[PDB]
């Protein structure tokens, strides 16, 4: 007999996000809020010379 099923998306993503009940769980899509990569190592101008 013909069947129809319901399900959700699943993709090859190693993104890990921390819930309350569980830490480090693979999530399809996440969004980061922290920025450490731009340490700079140089003191440029801030809107004008320093």
């Amino acid at each position: 007999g013909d069947t129809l099923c319901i399900g959700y998306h699943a993709n090859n993503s190693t993104d890990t996000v921390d819930t309350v009940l569980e830490k480090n769980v693979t999530v399809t899509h996440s969004v980061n809020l922290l920025e450490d990569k731009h340490n700079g190592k140089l003191c440029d101008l801030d809107g004008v010379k320093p």
């Binding site: 007999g1 013909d2 069947t3 129809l4 099923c5 319901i6 399900g7 959700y8 998306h9 699943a10 993709n11 090859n12 996000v17 921390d18 819930t19 309350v20 009940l21 769980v25 999530v27 399809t28 969004v31 809020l33």
Partner: protein, 157 residues
Amino acid sequence: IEGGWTGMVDGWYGYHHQNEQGSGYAADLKSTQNAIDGITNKVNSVIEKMNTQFTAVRIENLNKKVDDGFLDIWTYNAELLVLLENERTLDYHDSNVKNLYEKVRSQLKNNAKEIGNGCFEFYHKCDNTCMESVKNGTYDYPKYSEEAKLNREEIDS
């Protein structure tokens, strides 16, 4: 339902049909669109951490200890907000799948049998027209009502 489909490339929530015509993964644009809208708005509200707190003007040591301790307190609190709403969005996703499943149960009624998790075996035969009727929200119980009953009498005996 504890199965994630890698075949769904269209949407976060969808359907997998196996009829005479073929077998296909097909998303539900409406549900996933509303999910993305709601989580966008959630993320914006999360970003509303008010960390602008600053004062333009043994004391220096006290201001030092204070600023530092408040920093650690608020970092802990922010990671708390993150944990909380991570679970909250994941639970939201769960509820969306549940609602899709109820949308399908409502229309099918006894013309179908819940095989398991989120699957339905029609007692009647569905084209992709009769499949996209269910997805479109336009499946009619009477069209096949007796047609299913008959086959129920093959499971009865």
